[PDB]
Each structure stands twice: as C-alpha cells, then as structure tokens.
Amino acid sequence: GSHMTETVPLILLVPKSRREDLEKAQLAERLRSQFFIDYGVRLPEVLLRDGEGLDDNSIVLLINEIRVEQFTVYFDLMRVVNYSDEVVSFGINPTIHQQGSSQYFWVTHEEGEKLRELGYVLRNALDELYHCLAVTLARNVNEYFGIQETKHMLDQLEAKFPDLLKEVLRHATVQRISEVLQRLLSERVSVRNMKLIMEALALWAPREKDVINLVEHIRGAMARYICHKFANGGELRAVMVSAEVEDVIRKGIRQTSGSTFLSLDPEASANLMDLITLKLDDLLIAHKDLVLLTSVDVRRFIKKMIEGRFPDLEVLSFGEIADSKSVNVIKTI
Ligand SMILES: [Ca+2]
Ligand SMILES: [Ca+2]
Ligand SMILES: [Hg+2]
Ligand SMILES: [Hg+2]
Ligand SMILES: [Hg+2]
C-alpha cells in the first residue's frame, strides 16, 4: 500500500437496522476483494457508519468524508434488470426507484421466479449494491489510485516480463503510464491484464505522445477485454447513436498539432444534450446496465459531452464490441 489508499478510507452510511446483517454478509471485505478481481486495483479501507435518518433501504457513499452518492437498495427484494412495462400487464406492481432518468424496478422473490420463466433477468440485492458501488468507485478512481500504485504494478510485472517493461519505459514515463491506467479505469475498463496493456503501450507509445489519443489506441488493443467485461456473461444491452447525431459531433472536431478537441457553440452543445436527454428519457433499463454504441471516430467526444449529465452511461465503439455475442439494441438516439 501507499498513501493513496492508506490515508483515505471510504465510508458507507448504512441503516442501523441493517448494520448487523451487512457485517454478517461481509459487505466491506467483499467490496474490496471483488473490486480487485474485477478491475485490478485495490480500494482503500471501507468503514461502515450508521446513518442518521436513513430508511431501511438506503446507503450513502462518502469519499473524502464527502457525500458522493446515495443508493436505494431493496435488501428484501429482487431487481428486474431488463424490466419492461409488460410486467404491469401481468398484475405486478413493482417497487420503483429513480435517479436522474434512470429507473430501477424491484419485485418480490415470488414475482421474480415467475418473471424468470418469461426470460427476465434478476439480480439479488447485495449484487446490485456491489454493482452500484463499483460503477461509482471506478469513475472516482483518481481519489485512490496514482503513480505509487502504478509503480507497484510495473514492479510486479517486471518480475515476470523484464524486457517488456524495459521497452515500455523507453517510450513512456511512469507518470504517463499512470495516466493511461486512470483513464481506462475511469471508464470502467479493467487493468487486470497488465501484460496486454503493456504490450499495447510498447506498440503505441513510441508514436503517440498525446495522452487522450494514446488511450484510445490502448482501448482498441484491449477490445476483447472491454467487451467481455461489459457484457458480463450475458447479452450486451445497447443504445445506438444515430448517423445524424454522430455527424454533429464529427463537424465539431478540430485537429491540432497537439490534441484533438471538440469545438461546438455553447448553445449548440446545449441543444444536442437536450436531444440526447429526450431520447434517453423513456428507457426502462438503468444507464449503468447499458452502453452507448458509436463510431470509433466520435466515441471519446460523445463520452466527454454526456458525462456531466449521464455519468454512468459508458460509450463503446463498434470495434470495441467485435467479439460480442448477443447484442440487444433497445433504442437509437
Ligand atoms: Ca412487487
Ligand atoms: Ca436548454
Ligand atoms: Hg429469489
Ligand atoms: Hg446505482
Ligand atoms: Hg463480448
């Protein structure tokens, strides 16, 4: 460990009424172990604290002792991941939580079993809580991960692939590598496969000195791993960006002698955001459980544009999902 982790614990405010059960379930320990498995980096220590005034189905995450997000988890119910309105036709009244324009639908255990037979996918409450936390923690990676962690990882790798590390370091500094890794994690891409990441840096770093651009190439190299992560072991649920919207973005792109950036009139960008908002508004699958699909040329710009309003909606390129299996496009923007 380094200071990055060691000096800055995460705090979960939980209901007093659930504390003992969350201890028994080893919430804190399992969050830490699973996150490491899933993303390849270590979280800080996780402290539980009883939260004043919390109902029985609420959790708050504090980073740096500051409230970051409040989650609703129906501990005694089941979440319907691929909900549709058809469910109400069957005489089920779900329990519904909304955060922004994302909606979450919960049913009884008995109702769940019924729904499964009709091909709905269910998630248990602790599994949902872990997903919520993980998504939010990935985004906030810079709070607990940096050069010290990167250097450790490089050192571990070196012990195994010395010549590979040698080559990479000739073309990228530790700082630059750390930046690449943070940018991957912040977009929910795992860094567990360090060997592959390093092979891609050895290929690309000699030639690409702009960090944003470099990251895009690395993502490309890692395509299989990105896809497998997002899709889990299930179908990939997606919203497609229309050729129309792609073009608005494309026209706004300016190439320089340095970085490539998006340059849209503020009114124009606001109007485009209003359109994206409108198209997303009536979705019944939560944003963290979706991806937006677009062309490689516009992917990173679309991500930057929407992340203010829609922080939990990741954006993949068509190439990134080349190894996909079942894909379900639920909507076009
Ligand atoms: Ca119900
Ligand atoms: Ca407006
Ligand atoms: Hg169940
Ligand atoms: Hg969530
Ligand atoms: Hg995949």
Features:
333 residues; alpha/beta; Glutaredoxin; Ribosomal Protein L9, domain 1; Helicase, Ruva Protein, domain 3; 4 domains; four-stranded mixed beta sheet; four-stranded antiparallel beta sheet; 20% strand; binds calcium ion; binds mercury (II) ion
Topology:
Blueprint: H1 3-6, E1 10-14, H2 19-24, H3 27-39, E2 46-50, E3 58-63, E4 66-72, E5 78-80, H4 86-89, E6 95-99, E7 102-107, H5 109-116, E8 122-124, H6 125-139, H7 147-158, H8 162-169, H9 174-185, H10 194-204, H11 211-221, H12 223-230, E9 236-240, H13 243-251, E10 253-255, E11 260-262, H14 266-280, E12 291-294, H15 299-306, E13 314-317, E14 327-332
Helix pairs in contact: 3-6, 7-9, 8-10, 9-11, 10-11
Instruction: Note the gap between the termini.
Output: 44 Å
Order of helices and strands: HEHHEEEEHEEHEHHHHHHHEHEEHEHEE
Class derived from helix and strand content: alpha/beta
The tally of beta strands, per DSSP, is 14
- The number of distinct helices, counting runs of at least 4 residues, comes to 15
Largest sheet: 4 strands, mixed
Rg on CA atoms, Å:
21 Å
Reported by name, the CATH topology of the largest domain is Rossmann fold
Which hetero ligands occur in this complex?
Answer: calcium ion, mercury (II) ion
CATH class of the largest domain: Alpha Beta
Kindly estimate the percentage of residues that lie in beta strands according to DSSP: 15-25%
**Total domain units:** 4
Strand order of the largest sheet: 2-1-3-4
CATH homology-level superfamily of the largest domain: FHIPEP family, domain 4
Helix content: 40-55%
PDB class: protein transport
Keywords: protein transport, transport, pathogenesis
Assembly: monomeric
Entry title: Crystal structure of the C-terminal domain of InvA
